PDB file of C-alpha atoms in Angstrom:
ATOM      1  CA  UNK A   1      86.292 194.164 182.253  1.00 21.70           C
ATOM      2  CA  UNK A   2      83.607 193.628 179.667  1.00 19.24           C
ATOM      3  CA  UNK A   3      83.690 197.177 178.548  1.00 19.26           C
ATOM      4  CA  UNK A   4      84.106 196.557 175.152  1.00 19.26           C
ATOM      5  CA  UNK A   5      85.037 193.430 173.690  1.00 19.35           C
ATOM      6  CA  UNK A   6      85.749 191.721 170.603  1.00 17.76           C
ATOM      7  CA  UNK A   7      82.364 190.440 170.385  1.00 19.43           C
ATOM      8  CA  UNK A   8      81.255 194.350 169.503  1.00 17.48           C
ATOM      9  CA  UNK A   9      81.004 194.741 166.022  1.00 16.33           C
ATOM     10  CA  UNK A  10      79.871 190.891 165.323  1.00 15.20           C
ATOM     11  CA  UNK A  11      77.138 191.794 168.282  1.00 13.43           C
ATOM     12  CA  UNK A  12      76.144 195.131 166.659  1.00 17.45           C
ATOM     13  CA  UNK A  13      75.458 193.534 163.386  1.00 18.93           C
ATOM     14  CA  UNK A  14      73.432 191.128 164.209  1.00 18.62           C
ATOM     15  CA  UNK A  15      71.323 193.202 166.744  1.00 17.75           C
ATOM     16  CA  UNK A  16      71.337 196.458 164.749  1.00 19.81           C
ATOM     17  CA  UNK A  17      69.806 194.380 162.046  1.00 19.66           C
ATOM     18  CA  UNK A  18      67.485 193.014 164.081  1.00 18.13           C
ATOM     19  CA  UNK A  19      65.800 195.939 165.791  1.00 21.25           C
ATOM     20  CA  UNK A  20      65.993 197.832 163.512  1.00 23.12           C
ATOM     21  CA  UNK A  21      63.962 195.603 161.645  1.00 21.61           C
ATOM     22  CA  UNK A  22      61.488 196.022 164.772  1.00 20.44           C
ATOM     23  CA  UNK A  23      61.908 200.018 164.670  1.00 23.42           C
ATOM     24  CA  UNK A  24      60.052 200.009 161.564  1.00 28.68           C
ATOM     25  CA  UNK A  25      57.880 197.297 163.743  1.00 27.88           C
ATOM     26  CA  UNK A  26      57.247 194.694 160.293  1.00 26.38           C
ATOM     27  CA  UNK A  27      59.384 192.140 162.014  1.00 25.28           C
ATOM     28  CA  UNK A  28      58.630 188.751 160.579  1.00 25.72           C
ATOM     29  CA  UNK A  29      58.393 186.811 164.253  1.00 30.26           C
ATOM     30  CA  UNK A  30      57.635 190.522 166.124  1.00 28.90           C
ATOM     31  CA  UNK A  31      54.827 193.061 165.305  1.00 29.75           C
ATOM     32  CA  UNK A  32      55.459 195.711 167.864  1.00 28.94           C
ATOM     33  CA  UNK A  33      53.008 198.376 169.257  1.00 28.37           C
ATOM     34  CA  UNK A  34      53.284 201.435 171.504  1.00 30.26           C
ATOM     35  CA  UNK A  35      54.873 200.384 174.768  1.00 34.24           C
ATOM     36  CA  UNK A  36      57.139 198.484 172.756  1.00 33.32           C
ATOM     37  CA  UNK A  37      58.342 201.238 170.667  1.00 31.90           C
ATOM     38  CA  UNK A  38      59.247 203.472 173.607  1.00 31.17           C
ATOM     39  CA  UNK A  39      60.739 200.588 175.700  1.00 24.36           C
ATOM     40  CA  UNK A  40      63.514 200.185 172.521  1.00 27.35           C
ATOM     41  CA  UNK A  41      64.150 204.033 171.747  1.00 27.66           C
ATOM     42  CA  UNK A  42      64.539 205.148 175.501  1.00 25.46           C
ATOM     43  CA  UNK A  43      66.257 202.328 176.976  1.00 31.13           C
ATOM     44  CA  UNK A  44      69.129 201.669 173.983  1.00 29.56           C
TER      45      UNK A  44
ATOM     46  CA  UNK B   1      74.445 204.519 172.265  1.00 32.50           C
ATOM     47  CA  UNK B   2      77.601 205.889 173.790  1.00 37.08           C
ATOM     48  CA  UNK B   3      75.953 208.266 176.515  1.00 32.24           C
ATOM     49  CA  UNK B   4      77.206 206.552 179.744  1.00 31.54           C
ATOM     50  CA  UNK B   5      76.778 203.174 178.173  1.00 32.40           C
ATOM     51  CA  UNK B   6      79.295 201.490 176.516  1.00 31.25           C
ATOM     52  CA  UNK B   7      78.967 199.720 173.261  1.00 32.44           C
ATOM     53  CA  UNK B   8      79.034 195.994 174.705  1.00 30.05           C
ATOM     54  CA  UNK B   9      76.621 197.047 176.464  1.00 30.64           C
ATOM     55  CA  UNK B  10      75.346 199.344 174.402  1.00 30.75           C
ATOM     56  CA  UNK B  11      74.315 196.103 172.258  1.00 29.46           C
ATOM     57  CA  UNK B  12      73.439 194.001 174.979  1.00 26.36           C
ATOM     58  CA  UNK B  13      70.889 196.685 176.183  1.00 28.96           C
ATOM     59  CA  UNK B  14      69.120 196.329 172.455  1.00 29.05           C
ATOM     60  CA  UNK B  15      68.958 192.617 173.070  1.00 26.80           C
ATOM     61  CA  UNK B  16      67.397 193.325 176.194  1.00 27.28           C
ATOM     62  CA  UNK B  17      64.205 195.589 174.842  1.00 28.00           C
ATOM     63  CA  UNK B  18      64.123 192.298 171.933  1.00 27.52           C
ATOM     64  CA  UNK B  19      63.959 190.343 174.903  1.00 27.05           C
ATOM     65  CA  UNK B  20      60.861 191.701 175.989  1.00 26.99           C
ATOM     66  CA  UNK B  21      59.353 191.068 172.569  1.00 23.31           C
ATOM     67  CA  UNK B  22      59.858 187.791 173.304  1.00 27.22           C
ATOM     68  CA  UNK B  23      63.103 187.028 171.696  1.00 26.46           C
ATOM     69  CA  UNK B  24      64.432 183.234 172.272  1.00 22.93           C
ATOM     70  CA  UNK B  25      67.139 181.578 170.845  1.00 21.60           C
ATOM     71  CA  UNK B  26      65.112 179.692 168.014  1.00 21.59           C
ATOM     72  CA  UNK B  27      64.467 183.655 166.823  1.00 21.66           C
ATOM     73  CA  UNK B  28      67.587 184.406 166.767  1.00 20.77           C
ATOM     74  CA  UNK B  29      67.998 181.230 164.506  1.00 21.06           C
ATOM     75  CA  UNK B  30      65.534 182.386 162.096  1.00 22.17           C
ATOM     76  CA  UNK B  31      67.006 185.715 161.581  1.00 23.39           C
ATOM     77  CA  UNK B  32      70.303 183.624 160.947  1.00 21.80           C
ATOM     78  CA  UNK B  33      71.837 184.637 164.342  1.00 19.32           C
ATOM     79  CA  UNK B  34      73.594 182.236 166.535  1.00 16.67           C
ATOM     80  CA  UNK B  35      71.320 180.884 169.253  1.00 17.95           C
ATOM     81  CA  UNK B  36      74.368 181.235 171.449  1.00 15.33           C
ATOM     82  CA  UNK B  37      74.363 185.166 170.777  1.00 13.45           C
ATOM     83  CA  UNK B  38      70.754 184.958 172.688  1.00 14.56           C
ATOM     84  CA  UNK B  39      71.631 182.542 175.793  1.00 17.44           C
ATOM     85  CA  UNK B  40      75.253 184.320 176.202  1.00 20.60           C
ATOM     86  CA  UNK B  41      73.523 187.718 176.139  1.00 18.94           C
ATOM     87  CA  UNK B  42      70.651 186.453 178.654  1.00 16.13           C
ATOM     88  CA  UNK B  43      73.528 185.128 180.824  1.00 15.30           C
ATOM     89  CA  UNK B  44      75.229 188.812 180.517  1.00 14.11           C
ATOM     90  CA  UNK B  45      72.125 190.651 181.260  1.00 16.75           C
ATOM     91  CA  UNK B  46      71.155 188.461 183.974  1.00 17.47           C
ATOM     92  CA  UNK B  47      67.408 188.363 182.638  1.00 12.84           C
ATOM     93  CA  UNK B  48      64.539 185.597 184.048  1.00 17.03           C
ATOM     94  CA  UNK B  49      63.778 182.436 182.435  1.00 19.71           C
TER      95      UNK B  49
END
């Protein structure tokens, strides 16, 4: 029943900001390589 | 995105690929987002300690 909650634009926000931070791979905490780059752009 | 997923979990599944970066709480925290967003979302995708 947690298709969709109110949580979904707050949620997006903050994680859209985040990996996409890491989809240009210069994250501060994160430098991500190959495996990595597939694992995000497949999966979500 | 919206293919077969939905968007809860469509967000949840982007926390899970940060997740295998290595993505704790105290991360979270650093990027200004709620430690609670990581443990909740770790509860919700039912990933390992």
């Amino acid at each position: 029943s947690d298709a969709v909650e109110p949580s979904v634009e707050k949620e997006y926000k903050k994680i859209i900001s985040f990996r996409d931070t890491v989809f240009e791979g210069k994250h501060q905490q994160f430098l991500v390589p190959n495996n990595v780059r597939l694992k995000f752009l497949r999966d979500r | 995105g919206a293919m077969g997923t939905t968007n809860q979990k469509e967000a949840e599944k982007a926390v899970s690929q940060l997740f295998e970066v290595g993505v704790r709480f105290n991360d979270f925290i650093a990027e200004g987002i709620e430690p609670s967003v990581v443990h909740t979302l770790f509860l919700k995708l039912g990933l390992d300690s």
